Amino acid sequence: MMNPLIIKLGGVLLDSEEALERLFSALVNYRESHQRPLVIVHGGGCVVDELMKGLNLPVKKKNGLRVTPADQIDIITGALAGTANKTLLAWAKKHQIAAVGLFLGDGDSVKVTQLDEELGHVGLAQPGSPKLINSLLENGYLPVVSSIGVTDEGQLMNVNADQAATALAATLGADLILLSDVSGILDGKGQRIAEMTAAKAEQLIEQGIITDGMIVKVNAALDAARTLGRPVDIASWRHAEQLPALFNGMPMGTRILA
Amino acid sequence: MMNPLIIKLGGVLLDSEEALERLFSALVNYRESHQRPLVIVHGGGCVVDELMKGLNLPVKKKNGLRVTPADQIDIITGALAGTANKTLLAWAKKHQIAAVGLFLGDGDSVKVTQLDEELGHVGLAQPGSPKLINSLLENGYLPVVSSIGVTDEGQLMNVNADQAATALAATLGADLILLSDVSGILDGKGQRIAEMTAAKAEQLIEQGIITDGMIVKVNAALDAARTLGRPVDIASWRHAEQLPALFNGMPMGTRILA
Ligand SMILES: Nc1ncnc2c1ncn2[C@@H]1O[C@H](COP(=O)(O)OP(=O)(O)O)[C@@H](O)[C@H]1O
Ligand SMILES: Nc1ncnc2c1ncn2[C@@H]1O[C@H](COP(=O)(O)OP(=O)(O)O)[C@@H](O)[C@H]1O
Numbered sequence: 001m002m003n004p005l006i007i008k009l010g011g012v013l014l015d016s017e018e019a020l021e022r023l024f025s026a027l028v029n030y031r032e033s034h035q036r037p038l039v040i041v042h043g044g045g046c047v048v049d050e051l052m053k054g055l056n057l058p059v060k061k062k063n064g065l066r067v068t069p070a071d072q073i074d075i076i077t078g079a080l081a082g083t084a085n086k087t088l089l090a091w092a093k094k095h096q097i098a099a100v101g102l103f104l105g106d107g108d109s110v111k112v113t114q115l116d117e118e119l120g121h122v123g124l125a126q127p128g129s130p131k132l133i134n135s136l137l138e139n140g141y142l143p144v145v146s147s148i149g150v151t152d153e154g155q156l157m158n159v160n161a162d163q164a165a166t167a168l169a170a171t172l173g174a175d176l177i178l179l180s181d182v183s184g185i186l187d188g189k190g191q192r193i194a195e196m197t198a199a200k201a202e203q204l205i206e207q208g209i210i211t212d213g214m215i216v217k218v219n220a221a222l223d224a225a226r227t228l229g230r231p232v233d234i235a236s237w238r239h240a241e242q243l244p245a246l247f248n249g250m251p252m253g254t255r256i257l258a
Numbered sequence: 259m260m261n262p263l264i265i266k267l268g269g270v271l272l273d274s275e276e277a278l279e280r281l282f283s284a285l286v287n288y289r290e291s292h293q294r295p296l297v298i299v300h301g302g303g304c305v306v307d308e309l310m311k312g313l314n315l316p317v318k319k320k321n322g323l324r325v326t327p328a329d330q331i332d333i334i335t336g337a338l339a340g341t342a343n344k345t346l347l348a349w350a351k352k353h354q355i356a357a358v359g360l361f362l363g364d365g366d367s368v369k370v371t372q373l374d375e376e377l378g379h380v381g382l383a384q385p386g387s388p389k390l391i392n393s394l395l396e397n398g399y400l401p402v403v404s405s406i407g408v409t410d411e412g413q414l415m416n417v418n419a420d421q422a423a424t425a426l427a428a429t430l431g432a433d434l435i436l437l438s439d440v441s442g443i444l445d446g447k448g449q450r451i452a453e454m455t456a457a458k459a460e461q462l463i464e465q466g467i468i469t470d471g472m473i474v475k476v477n478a479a480l481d482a483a484r485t486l487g488r489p490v491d492i493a494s495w496r497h498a499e500q501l502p503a504l505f506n507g508m509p510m511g512t513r514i515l516a
Contacts, residue, residue, distance in 0.1 A: 051333075074341050075309075082340015083332050086361060086414060087405060091364060094412025100390070103344060105351060106358045107399070132358070135397065141365070141390075148344060154352025156344060161430060 008165035010043035010183040026243035037137040043161025044080035064216040073121040081148040099142040104149030107132025112149030123157025125167035166224040179237040180250040184253030225258040262432040265292030266423035268301035269439040284501035295395040301419025302338035322474040331379040339406040357400040365390025370407030379416025383425035424482040437495040442511030483516040490514040
């Protein structure tokens, strides 16, 4: 079987039924015209944000990663591993796709450990075992993986979805496409940056252009690029007309160079 | 491979770390002393109840089944398919059990359709395909299945966990044990009823002894009993000393006769 293709979803995508429909239309088209098996990895995006906002719970970040107190891991796991994951599975079913929902701990696909006590239940994702997912792909299923994980001691961990995607890409030796609200990484004028290298990323970070989770996202993409030995794309899920070509390789956002 | 054994969990079990530890201890012991593969099916129990109570959301029932409005299916799916499911997966990991979390729609294990428009997003569970779960069992995994499902049109459905367990038992041709807060079905004096037949169940329901979801639970157990052609047990998860023998066959609650 070929190296799979991981398409990572997140942001406010789940807030738009229209965007979800156009996305799944493109997913079905990709599947029915390619031999490379697909794998979806997703974060919490608007599902978690809106819930937290509704529960009047603050969202604080420390170096791009949002602090996840022990008294909130259950509700976040619910919104991320539960609501977001199952909503995506429902869209897959609606489009006659046989999908299987998983989280990072299933089949020890991605190994997770506590990243920093100051962050609480935030996990550090590293490559795991590709056996379970490889078996699902062989059997014709579309794995849909949430960014929640668990330590060997049984503690639930909230993992940055981009870092989770990169860790799974390494695990599966898969190509990777990170879909976000914006068209890749933006420069100081808010314009799309076509190509990215570690050297340029360092400069942009130094200049304050790349900040917050974007630092985590770019570093993750760069990590995947060097590990896989090939480019990783960061692009938008907003423009339907662009999805088919993007999935097939047309550069629509920021190409992270290995 | 042998007919698997489904152990259904629910109630306030997840509110007790002690009960969860003693349960998983018994699960590990069962696994390491039996060739029959285990499968866990679970409901939302206290996880959903406490969340709803906290969100000041009412919990209304109609014939034992709780009404699930469209504006609540997402949060319930989160608590049930997300929090409850992953908490159980965390306990499994903690006990070195290789488990895989699933919901009713994965591999179309259990087919779900809307039960009644008056109930909202409440699903009717019927036998599905045993292929996915059979493959996981063959590969050495412990499937942990939540009672959330999805219709072919992509609508998420909240399914009574006992009915979900029975539907999966039929699907897999599995033995079944339903664990609850109380020791089986209680009579008018609140005493345990050792054995149950359809005839006796009809009488107890007529007398107002069996009510609410217990009507759903007993009817579900009776349905499984007649379909499988063998007895189904309803017992408690509260007394640790009783678990090992129960899992091996000792009658500790109410045995539903086929
Ligand atoms: N240089 C940058 N280029 C692009 N986005 C950036 C940059 N610096 C910070 N960001 C922030 O990163 C956000 C996207 O990352 P994130 O919030 O994690 O959501 P997502 O990946 O789903 O789009 C943008 O909405 C923006 O606010
Ligand atoms: N005849 C009966 N025997 C036993 N339990 C009954 C009976 N009639 C009603 N019940 C109700 O059923 C409850 C158990 O079912 P349920 O609430 O669905 O939780 P669970 O199955 O996790 O124990 C008991 O707590 C009791 O309030």
